[PDB]
Amino acid sequence: GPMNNDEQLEFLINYLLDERSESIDIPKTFSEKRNLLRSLMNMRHPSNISEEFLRIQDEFLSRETANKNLTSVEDISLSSGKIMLWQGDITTLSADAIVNAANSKLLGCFIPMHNCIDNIIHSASGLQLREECNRMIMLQGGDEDVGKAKITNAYNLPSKYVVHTVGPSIERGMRVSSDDVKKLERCYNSCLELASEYKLNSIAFCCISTGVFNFPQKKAAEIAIRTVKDFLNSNETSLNHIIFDVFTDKDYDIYKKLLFGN
Ligand SMILES: Nc1ncnc2c1ncn2[C@@H]1O[C@H](COP(=O)(O)OP(=O)(O)OC[C@@H](O)[C@@H](O)[C@@H](O)CO)[C@@H](O)[C@H]1O
Ligand SMILES: [Zn+2]
């Protein structure tokens, strides 16, 4: 019984629904079915699942990834030495490592359909990403501190690895402290160091802490660029491309000014 795309979606939804206590009339349209799969994956605490599920999940998500408009590193025109600036979706970029602005529990996002980068990454990667992270935290015996990095396989993403970092959060209407700056610096440093240790050719950062974490976007960009330039000026590294993956026009305009205003 080889399965077509729709049968794979049905199988995945039904497997996860059978695990849940709640009853949900199965949706009809493609948006409703796909969004249900993502919701159920989002909510699923780590627990053993069938080799069959994971096989089918991988086929489905891998096929979804292949059918996106993907970007290779060599496709990116806008570079300043090893630094690249690129606006787009990090789940469609075939960098060796992408950086996830993760939470301190590191299991991804359990809020269904939440468009934080953590949810988006886990949703495209597969449930193995949450599982790998669960193991790491279990063994660590504790929540992940801000300003660190853990690397995992990227699974069904077009990248090879996900580097998970937890950034500083700025409370509504409060200024950034020196400690806040040092924490964000540390996230950039820790990701660059880990990807360098793993002998990677490329890493793509998201704009850490500038979404829901309210880090002022000019200030964050200045830190990110300074930390990356200091790192390249001070270290031998396998890294040949450090990609600033921006998601908003506002971030693009900021990074463009800072990198190419010269
Ligand atoms: N597909 C995409 N590709 C590239 N960039 C994307 C993206 N989707 C969103 N972004 C951008 O990712 C950055 C981090 O935002 P986010 O709001 O995801 O992240 P942060 O502001 O760093 O806040 C951290 C929280 O999300 C975190 O602690 C947890 O609670 C998670 O569960 C912002 O610049 C977003 O616009
Ligand atoms: Zn979220």
Numbering used by the authors: -1 to 260
Sentences from the paper on this structure:
In some pathogenic microbes, the response to oxidative stress is controlled by a SirTM/zinc-containing macrodomain (Zn-Macro) pair responsible for establishment and removal of the modification, respectively. Strikingly, however, the “catalytic loop” found in all other MacroD-type enzymes (also termed “loop 1”) is replaced with and extended loop containing the zinc-coordinating Cx(4)HxC motif, here termed the Zn-loop. To gain a closer understanding of the functional role of the 3α-bundle and coordinated Zn2+ ion, we solved structures from the three sub-branches of Zn-Macros namely from S. aureus (SauMacro), Methanobrevibacter oralis (MorMacro), and macrodomain-fused SirTM protein (Mfs1) from Fusarium oxysporum f.sp. cubense race 1 (Foc1Mfs1) in their apo form as well as of S. pyogenes (SpyMacro) and MorMacro bound to ADP-ribose (ADPr). In all structures, the Zn2+ ion is tetrahedrally coordinated with three metal-coordination residues within the Zn-loop, while the fourth coordination-contact is exchangeable and is provided by either ADPr, a water molecule, or a symmetry-related protomer within the crystal.
Interestingly, the major difference between the SpyMacro and MorMacro complex with ADPr is the form of the distal ribose. In SpyMacro, the ribose adopts a furanose ring with a 2′ endo pucker, while the distal ribose in MorMacro is in the linear form. Surprisingly, neither MorMacro, which arises from a minimal operon containing only the Zn-Macro/SirTM pair, nor Zn-Macros derived from Msf1 fusion proteins could demodify SpyGcvH-L. In contrast, all Zn-Macros could demodify Glu-/Asp-ADP-ribosylated PARP1 E988Q.
